[PDB]
């Protein structure tokens, strides 16, 4: 849910 996950997946 954090942005790092949402942007890199």
């Amino acid at each position: 849910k954090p942005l790092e996950e949402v942007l890199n997946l």
Partner: antibody
Amino acid sequence: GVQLQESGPGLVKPSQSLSLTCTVTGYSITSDYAWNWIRQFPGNKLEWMGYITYSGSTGYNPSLKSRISITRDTSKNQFFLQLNSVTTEDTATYYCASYDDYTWFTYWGQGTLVTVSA
Amino acid sequence: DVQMTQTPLTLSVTIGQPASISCESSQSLLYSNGKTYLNWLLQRPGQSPKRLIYLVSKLDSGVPDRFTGSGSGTDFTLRISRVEAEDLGVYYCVQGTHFPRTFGGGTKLEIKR
């Protein structure tokens, strides 16, 4: 190098649709990062409203989900905020901002004041 | 929603003296990838917020080394080793671990003079 700029009306009538524009220069909104809308209320209280990712997915604050929409124009390098059914409680300064929370890249607009009044 | 408590409300400090702000999160901001997403913003009067610290302790480009961020779990701290005139403004912390992103009430820094 990068610059974000908010534009749109300063005065909106209650129940109408608020429509803001964030114009971006110096970077493409299709490349990377999350592109956010944040508003500050009188008293200095900040509220994250929502974002659109570089890929086009959207996240909305659950308190707004019902009446918030975020879109983009990839040819103009702009993203937009549409907030329906505005009340006087929606009077606030609206910022657009770009970040990712794990990288150095971070940029805020200068903000634009929106007054909801009759 | 995770709520963030800032202390103190305001803060009056003489130029050259230290200062620190606390931010307590209701829940652990430690995420399942070992990273903790807590940032610090400074809003100078009449200007828009600017990020100082991210990932707890990392300095943003342009930020003087006078600024130090520490903490973990629920307790976090921002330390200004030596206050200068242009440190004047309102400081916020913000968490980007739990949806939705939430901010602290802010801490106002005044210059004792």
